[PDB]
UniProtKB/Swiss-Prot annotation, chains A, B, C, D, E, F, G:
GO terms for biological process: intracellular water homeostasis; monoatomic ion transmembrane transport; protein homooligomerization. One of its GO terms (molecular function) is identical protein binding. This is Small-conductance mechanosensitive channel. Belongs to the MscS (TC 1.A.23) family. The chain crosses the membrane at residues 1-21. Mechanosensitive channel that participates in the regulation of osmotic pressure changes within the cell, opening in response to stretch forces in the membrane lipid bilayer, without the need for other proteins. Contributes to normal resistance to hypoosmotic shock. Forms an ion channel of 1.0 nanosiemens conductance with a slight preference for anions. The channel is sensitive to voltage; as the membrane is depolarized, less tension is required to open the channel and vice versa. The channel is characterized by short bursts of activity that last for a few seconds. Homoheptamer. The keyword Ligase does not apply. Its main location: membrane. It is found in: Cell inner membrane. The chain holds residues 91 to 280 of 286 of the full protein. Keywords: Cell inner membrane, Cell membrane, Ion channel, Ion transport, Membrane, Transmembrane, Transmembrane helix, Transport. It comes from the Bacteria.
């Protein structure tokens, strides 16, 4: 009959209902934020929360995306806002990174010259950007050269594959050897 | 006799009861949201939060699923909406990935040609989609080729197994060798 | 003498008491939810939160389980619902997974035939379900075959052990060899 | 002079004081909960929150335990109730696990027979419980047998040590060899 | 018709809406905080949340950064405030670290002298700062020296590459050898 | 002019200020709790939060401690009461652990006898407590024996060092050999 | 027109704004707390939350530090108090730790005598503090000795480097050898 216990228990029930809606309400707020700022739109290859693919559509509660191999992934908007966004289509030009390990005894300037010839021969490589072919690091078993090449995002993978194959062919022709993991022993007969 | 301490303690009890219901209320809210949006329904092979299988049924509090090995798992809906969900039946066609390591001295174009012949021989491979047979990377002990092949989700595993067996047979016939991890030594008698 | 500071401090004390009860109230709510939905009952092998065993009984505050080796573990219900739950007795039939590594030179179809003969010989194997014996993958030092066998949950371990022993004996008899990790070396005296 | 700002600021101070007491109040609530259900008492070997030892006494704020090496550890009761806690004194009988690696060429049934003789020789081994001596797994360099033996909790360690020593002596006497990590090499003179 | 249930339910709805806005409001507060303290501004190379790049622009809700390879990353301001932020352009001069591993029998003072000559030869090295060339550590297979060189941020990478190439050339000329992973063996042929 | 918006906004500001003080108030509450239970007092060797050393003094907000190497660490009391604390000085006697790896062919009982003689010779070892010298584990390359020795906390490290040196000397004198990592090869000329 | 819905929605907006300011207000409270206790001050080398350097200045919202190599780091104060803080400059004298691995056959007391002579010869070593030169442990491939040396914080690194170089030179002169990773083989011709 008291008017205080009833209002207290209804307030407790209301806060419980709010805490229940918590997940869905947070996700829908995240989704409406995403749509009204549109950092990324449907149909462009991107990466969200560590998983990459083309987003088919974005919904109020979550988003639907398809990776390269055909996985259909539904990601709740809360994680998109919590996580990072890695957009690919925003920049038409990107950069490929080749790491080539060669033997210690192999000539240095010869490798740089042949790599420069290879990259200059390729036409899909953006010549305006830097053509980086430098001795990167002195590895445990082989010295590693680094190659940074800028090219359009559309033909990035094809450029990578063609450059790698040409590198293999030219290295085989020129006698430069890709070394297996080296190691040396010391015999001690007992 | 005071009417303020009693209402205060009843309010504290009510908020405590709400915080008690927290887990069950959140889980049931997530479950009803999933039911009323239905990213996936019962009877399709999917993966939730890292565990995969066929969902037998979905309940208000959690969901029941069977792993490929007959394992029965109940997953709370709160973690489902908090986690990532991926579906297999949504996309009828998926893509298999083969990674084949071959010795450095092995011929390059011959391997590509024989792999293309193998994939063309198979009929369950979708001809409309791409057939990527390219050099992928120069590994420490062997050069790795990548093969990306699209096929229907129903027969994906069978296509994978048959392609792998045919690859093994053809490589053995053609003399191409799968190399063991190479090592280099340098004798130093003391 | 003020009637506002006193009600404020009593309200603060009440919310503090609620936040104190937080753990016990959440755990008891979780336990009552479990008992009134009974996803699992007492006396059947299960796995909660990564630790597995047979539950002796379930209480309002936590649950009591006995591990295979005899560990007595009491698990709070809150983390039981927070984490996943695995059940064994729900599905009377499960699937065993054998992975067998063999040398590259070993015959392929002979191994498949002998494995099929072995699994056919065993009677506890459920013949209605699939009996997969396929080349699974090309390992670094040995090709690994996969065997999937469906059998009743009661005799799963015994079937596994008997199949493994028979595999060992038949492989020894037939000349098939389990290869040790294979390396290859290149001598170059200095 | 306003009566609303003062009550508002005192309420804010009260909730701040409650959030201050948060840790101590939660810990004492957990402690009293553990006291009045007493899943474990003082003086028996247990493992709480990943650290094992004999609990000396339990307090309202935390618990005091002594590790086997003499470390004195004080654990807050909140972490006690949060994580999994296990007891060893609850079950008078536990199970020891032996993993014995032997060479591929070693006789199978001979090892099983000698292990059965060893376990039958020991009297502290519970005869009623199972005596599992089966080929467990085919390891990379050796085949591993599993031995599961039930015995009283008090003499578990002594049984383990005596069984291990007898296993070593019997294996040395019978000619069974514990293999070192086996390696295979292939010479390539260049 | 009651005036208490309606206000209670509207208060619950309002707190639910606030908990929905939670993420957006926190992120916008973080962004405005960043704007009005400007720890970093657009167009300078920075590294936040573990990802590095040039800040193309800063928005109220998030920040847009271009990675060195051309990647576009959108980072919510909540991560910037919560995580650590690192700046490059704030300090015009930085320090390059070189770790060089040599043979155990190689001369010590000769290496230090040649390294000092190398660093003195370079002009972009800031001579006012220290030029640390000391025996750092006695590694498992080689002794490692550390070189610390201070130079302007603009030419840091070029200085690093040129110094490394000159180190390689001078070491080859002087006969100092970079040792492969050493490991000796003992023969106990049965 | 409204008297409701003003009280609402002042209440919001008050709860914001409470959330501001949250960390400092929690830390000071934890500190005063630790002071008034004093689980550890100033000037004793302890370990908390993964860092060990002697606490110089404890403050209301945090604590000041010095590591064995002279490091000065200030640790917030909140994380102290959140984590686990262990005290070296509480127990005057602790237990030292020795793990000794010996060859497979080495005599078993001889090693146990010589270790028992060594520990008997030492006087700082508490003879009342157990002195365990038993075979412990069958390693991949060497069998590991276990030694548990109880001694006063003051001379624990000195006892450890002296016992280790005596073990080394006695093993060298008696012909027992500490084996290098063993490994087996199988030549296969091609 | 109702006076209850308006106050409810304004209260919800106020709590939303409070939760928005939450991060910045918590950080500023942490910063002012640090200032008014000044556990560390500008210009002294310290380590906060895992990143080390000299703090240039401390602000209300965060702090600015420059690492050894010149990176500019902005650390929020909330993370500062959340994590540990260690001060190098508070204690004028610290302790360097050398670990020296030597062969099993090398003399024990000779190495200790050499190390004692080396540390005694050095003058920057604090003679009042202990000079620990003891056999630390029996490594897998080499026995490791530990050397603990106390010296002023200013010349700690120089003392370390000079001691290491002198150790190398003296060990080379005395014939003591730093062993490469040992390993043993067993020939098994097939
Ligand atoms: C200009 C830029 C583009 C702007 C685009 C704005 C619109 C796109 C972003 C907002 C998304 C639009 C809203 C989509 C809501 C779809 C909700 C559908 C839910 C549904 O299907 O339920 C119905 C089924 O009916 P039912 O069976 O569940 O009903 C049972 C009752 N008893
Ligand atoms: C668009 C179409 C969607 C179709 C599916 C809609 C979603 C599913 C339909 C609603 C399902 C809601 C859950 C209904 C099943 C609840 C069963 C509970 C029964 C139970 O265990 O307790 C009762 C007796 O149990 P008891 O003996 O414990 O008595 C209780 C004394 N307290
Ligand atoms: C068909 C389905 C039916 C399902 C039925 C489910 C039944 C199981 C779930 C209900 C369990 C109810 C909870 C009972 C737990 C036992 C509590 C006993 C505690 C107790 O004995 O008190 C002690 C006090 O200790 P004390 O003696 O020191 O007294 C000092 C007190 N202030
Ligand atoms: C089946 C029987 C089970 C029995 C269960 C009930 C008993 C076990 C649980 C209760 C244990 C209570 C133990 C006492 C806890 C509080 C001890 C505080 C004593 C203390 O330090 O006060 C003094 C103050 O210290 P001070 O002298 O500095 O005074 C400065 C004051 N402002
Ligand atoms: C005893 C030790 C010493 C204690 C005191 C020293 C430690 C505390 C020192 C800091 C205390 C004062 C805090 C000042 C912080 C800097 C505030 C600068 C803000 C600023 O630059 O704004 C300007 C306006 O610039 P704006 O135009 O962009 O502002 C557009 C607004 N509408
Ligand atoms: C001196 C310091 C200067 C630096 C600091 C100040 C710099 C500026 C700070 C403020 C920047 C604000 C930028 C974010 C606001 C952009 C709002 C755009 C919204 C929009 O695009 O809508 C359009 C209509 O399009 P719509 O139809 O989608 O809108 C659907 C509405 N119902
Ligand atoms: C078992 C026996 C009982 C043991 C009890 C132990 C109790 C220990 C005593 C605790 C008392 C508090 C200890 C910390 C007090 C530190 C206060 C320092 C404040 C301060 O530095 O201000 C002055 C500098 O002046 P200022 O700059 O702060 O002045 C304000 C301008 N804004």
């Amino acid at each position: 009959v008291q008017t205080a216990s009833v209002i207290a228990v209804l307030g407790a029930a209301g806060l419980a209902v709010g805490l229940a809606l918590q997940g869905s309400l947070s996700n829908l707020a995240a989704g409406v934020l995403l749509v009204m700022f549109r950092p990324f739109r449907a149909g462009e290859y991107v990466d969200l929360g560590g998983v990459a693919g083309t987003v088919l559509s974005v919904q109020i509660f979550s988003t639907t995306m398809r990776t390269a191999d055909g996985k259909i992934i539904v990601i709740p908007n809360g994680k998109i806002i919590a996580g990072n966004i890695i957009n690919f289509s925003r920049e038409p030009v990107r950069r490929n990174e080749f790491i080539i390990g060669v033997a210690y005894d192999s000539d240095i300037d010869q490798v740089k010259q042949i790599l420069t010839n290879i990259i200059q021969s390729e036409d899909r490589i953006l010549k305006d950007r830097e053509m980086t072919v430098r001795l990167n690091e002195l590895g445990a078993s082989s010295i590693n050269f680094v190659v940074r090449v800028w090219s359009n995002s559309g033909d990035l993978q094809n450029v990578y594959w063609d450059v790698l194959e040409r590198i293999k062919r030219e290295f085989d022709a020129a006698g430069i050897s890709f070394p297996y993991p080296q190691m040396d022993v010391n015999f001690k007969r007992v």
